[model samples]
Target chain A: MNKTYAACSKNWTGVGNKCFYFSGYPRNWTFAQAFCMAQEAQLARFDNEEELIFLKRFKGDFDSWIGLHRESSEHPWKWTNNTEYNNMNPILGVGRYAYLSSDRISSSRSYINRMWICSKLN
Target chain B: MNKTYAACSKNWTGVGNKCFYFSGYPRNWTFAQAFCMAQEAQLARFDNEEELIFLKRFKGDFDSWIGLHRESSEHPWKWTNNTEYNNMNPILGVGRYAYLSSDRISSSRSYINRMWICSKLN
Candidate 1:
């Protein structure tokens, strides 16, 4: 079927082929992950540059937790809700968690609560 | 004008209304910014979620420099080629530089050279 589910659940925004929830409550990466889990949704996993543009609009200053994370600097990045991971990223620091930035996806700082966007296919 | 510009110069790729340059060379944030300037372009500034999705497809491993950066740990973020700066971003561990990732915009890990994407209005 070619039907499209364009609207997200309560407080979520629908754009293009996806539905998103731009959250105002601040939480750390792990905490945010738990919140999404409780909702049966994963913290937003940015699938493409196009998907991220949607996120930029909602992300204000500070950083928000995302589905992107790693075990540490030596491990690869994997999404919280998915089973696949990419090992292309070179190790930097202890930055194993990711967040939403105005321009791009960030993992430089953790342990901070910032705005976040939760996305899913609609 | 309601005109649409498709296709980018040389190695750049075009999507929707923007043309992007996905770089194969790796450089630190500062160096990548300079590289894009030399090409009469700034390192790609993720304008929206849509724009970033394009970047994720090309960002391989490690971290590439991006248009996102702050003046200092307690400063604002701005585009290299333009004067518009966003102060919404909070200070986090000097993760002052940005790069392209498979999922989202990452600035947590800098000081390393990784692949990058550049964009220009066609």
Candidate 2:
């Protein structure tokens, strides 16, 4: 049977192929990634200008988490799904930060209590 | 090493053991569930009053998705993780709806293009 996507009324907004969850809770970067996976999705991935612009539209002043993170000591910005970074804004640099939220600009690993975004195939 | 929860700046907020994703893109209900799962997390589950209250705080005027869906025609409200629903507000009834957003008071299975929430173990 054909499937349909519904909105999460508790605390989120939905549009197109994405659902926006405004979590009032906090978790670690790794935990954030795991949280999305547990739901059958992966950390949010930005593949084009449209997605990034869409994200910027709904996101507030907080720095939310995305699929990009540095898993090794080298701290290379990589998608949590292991995909290489491409089509990113040149002004944003390599996008080394793994997490995104409304606060803080630095991508330091020590920072906690941030939000994140996840994505999946439709 | 000790772990700490961080925030998702792109389009989500974090607190405690949860991370809320706010996808501006709309997808089908199945796609919404899969979206969270792709992030290594499952649809958001409200195990207690605190979680529900927290969700209410950040959520704007949109309905969101949670980890409760009826896999069978019987339409039993079950957690996406297969857990039983407990501690829900008595006034809210069985909570049969799987998606949680700020709109639509009905839980019929035909609604599409809505937002959702996900949860994971800390």
Candidate 3:
């Protein structure tokens, strides 16, 4: 069942406890996360498949900083909120951050600049 | 539009040009791929939303390796057949192999022993 969320700010869409804002501009994962924090939000964290699908359709093959990352290949990846993380398609190789990448692919931290989706608890 | 496939061997359900076999047993992504290869098949590749949903619900919360992986964080991910890879969830951190994992999470290659799903041409 879909849960109700409090109203989000102007131009933000509320879904469940999350309020989302998609940036029109591009940036790296680090920049994206910093931008979100600056705006009192965080990179979006997906709680379920529906949310994933929503982000997928919304992004439609563009890269964005997500809320997940790791220290290294040996480190277990974790969400920005410190929730444990996992995936159906494993990210291969070592990288610093996580981003919703081109074609909705989850990419490790990179120098690539891309737009981002941010979310805050409403 | 759906394409008709020939009847699959016994328990295998036919969908389009693909025939799927859900196992009563579990195997890792490697073993699953090997087993499928032995059986003249390969790990399942999702071509559309319907197939992903079908597999997602079929597996429930269980872990299974599908046909996806990357060599390293630097290398681009590619499907088993080498279709440049992507996902709804970005796998965080460096790991090599891609498998359909827990929570429909995509996981990189590792020692995680999990169930696998295989698909064959009918």
Candidate 4:
């Protein structure tokens, strides 16, 4: 598969094998996953620091949800696929909250609404 | 609250109290949900026939996931909120698949990839 990818719209960008488009609306962690699947892609998965840097660029303006969450109150922060959280940029906070857009990196489990980006892997 | 709503982008439209934007890609059912939450919105929820008609306009071009799914093999189709599936336009097929864009109205459970839309409820 081609390593370089980009979304059709400038608003969308390439990360790893997939192109991502971010939006400014909040759905719960579960619903966001289904939305991407319906579109024939996976949640935005960052496999390396390069992808993390690309995603971090989206910080400070708006918070975009990625494919990380704790399904239950006691579960650990894991990808939707149940993959273990093992990466260079591991979510460095509590597990209940999803990633947020703020100067201060923090996680919240209030289950409030937010927007997200979807990724299509090549 | 103002009932009449609309998405910022023309591609994005208003359904009920939320504004929605659709992208073409595929993420799993769960990941898509998280994506939306990161953006501060919810999965597109159709509250009436009018909204369904609006969504059906997107039927032919691409498959956009809505907020409906079965968590397990035997679970009934429910919104992420766990509210009972009590709506006029109930999902009319097997619960495994999210909404697909095809001539035939069908649902699939193969866990393949697809694209989706997110909604910000006001």
Candidate 5:
């Protein structure tokens, strides 16, 4: 007999090596990041464009914060883990934080409230 | 890197080595059996009481045909693959076909139309 373990917790969607949760409530980008941190996760990160597309399509038309952000225009974009963002997907808008719009990542001010996606390795 | 394969197809839930699908439309037991056959599956069969409870709880208040049935009172109950029912869980009602109630299997006529569950090995 074969037995399988669940790769994601309840309500979290699994893809590749990670599990993702689309938040139902809105919060400031920094608060959302901390919220994910509280759960031992981080705001969503993507390894490829298909993953970006999947998260965008899965959440429908809603906007949500992701893990990409920068300290300022002078600094480089980086992930929640402080690793440099390698242009896995193009960044749009000009601000300190990155979020998913209907199509792609848009940079915005961190204080603006929005729903967020959290992710962790399975 | 750890990668996992989906144990169930789209719309099917995996439990142990089996994948289960709860039908959205109603059909008579015989038609339902043939429907599952067309999909390369069979009406649901339970290996233990916990599975019975899981399916029952997952389906909410709806009743659905399972794999248990017999030709007549003279014959012993059996599963879809023709294996004799091992009494893994108690059977209720007194008809040739078995469908699930809120709590347990309730025997009923095969001609009655109802939603059904199908299962296949993962």
Candidate 6:
């Protein structure tokens, strides 16, 4: 059979159960988040360390936005989907939005321009 | 984040771009095909040698139904999705339905009960 049966759209990468899109251009966190929402997905969210590593391995040399944020250091971290973070990995620094680089998730300002990743259920 | 982002559903295995389920019970070809359809999928169809090898590797020691069939050996083989086969691999034997085992695909009687594989785009 020759029909397309892939779980991911063209140019998106599939891993485990999710389809991911890594941006070639940088955008601020909110714009990247909005961009993902426009595509029927959200900025990347992770459920485990494996997912985080997968993102880090593929996000190239630049930091990228993920769907993690908190109102302040007093607030608990949360995902774009409104799920509370379970501390699968530690978030470093003290900013409102989160970006992933190397093997770490670090917080940053919402307006910082950076490459980003988007993900959705396939 | 704890929400699921997987492309494949529970209990199904994802490889490359497809989700696959290996049935634990035996059933006739039509029944197996119907079972897959009931789950919003079709009987396993392959577009390349890698997919076929994946099926053969995971089909265990028993023969399993695939989405292939023809009419009396005069008609061309077709998938359950009704696409004409492109001969990515050879279909051996002259039976009306196809079953896979040990890296080979062979035609067989539709009424014969056998384990099966079902697949869908994740």
TM per candidate comes to 0.44, 0.43, 0.45, 0.42, 0.53, 0.51
Give model 6's docking category: incorrect
* Residue B9 C-alpha lDDT in model 1: 50
Looking at model 1, residue B47 earns an lDDT score of 62
Question: Positional deviation of A55 in candidate 4, in angstroms?
Answer: 30
- What is chain B's TM-score across the candidates, in the order shown? 0.75, 0.71, 0.78, 0.72, 0.90, 0.92
**Which of the predicted structures, 1 or 4, would earn the higher DockQ when compared with the native?**
1
Q: After superposition, how far is residue A82 of candidate 6 from its true place, in Å?
A: 1.2
The global C-alpha lDDT for each of the candidates, from Candidate 1 onward, is: 0.60, 0.55, 0.65, 0.57, 0.78, 0.81
Stretches > 4 Å off in candidate 6: A1-6, B1-122
Please provide, for model 4 over B11-118, each residue's C-alpha lDDT reduced to its tens digit, 9 standing for 90 to 100: 344333445655557776567778877777656666655455545544335676767767664676666666666645545576565564643334666455667767
Residue B56, candidate 6: how far off, in angstroms? Answer: 29
lDDT of 1 at B97: 75
Error of 3 at A48 (Å): 1.0
Candidate 3: chain B TM-score against the reference chain B: 0.78
lDDT score, residue B50, model 3?
Answer: 46
When candidate 3 is compared with the true two-chain complex, its DockQ is 0.02
- Share of true Cα-Cα contacts across chains kept by each model: 0.00, 0.00, 0.00, 0.00, 0.00, 0.07
Q: Local error of candidate 6 at A115, Å? A: 0.3
The superposed Cα distance between candidate 5 and the true structure at residue A99, in angstroms, equals 0.4
Every candidate's CA RMSD: 13.2, 13.5, 16.7, 18.8, 8.7, 11.4
Q: Kindly list the per-residue Cα lDDT of model 6 for residues A1-122, writing each as its tens digit.
A: 33434446655655566777888899899899999999999999877554666577557468899998899988999889998989868889989899987668888788889999998886
The docking category that best describes candidate 1 is incorrect
In candidate 5, stretches whose alpha carbon ends up further than 4 angstroms from where it belongs are: A1-3, B1-122
- Between prediction 3 and prediction 4, the one with superior TM-score is 3
Q: How close to the true structure is residue B93 of candidate 2, measured as C-alpha lDDT?
A: 30
In order of lDDT, best first, we have 6, 5, 3, 1, 4, 2
**lDDT, candidate 2, residue B6?**
31
Residue A115's lDDT within candidate 4 is: 72
Residue B19 lDDT (model 5):
62
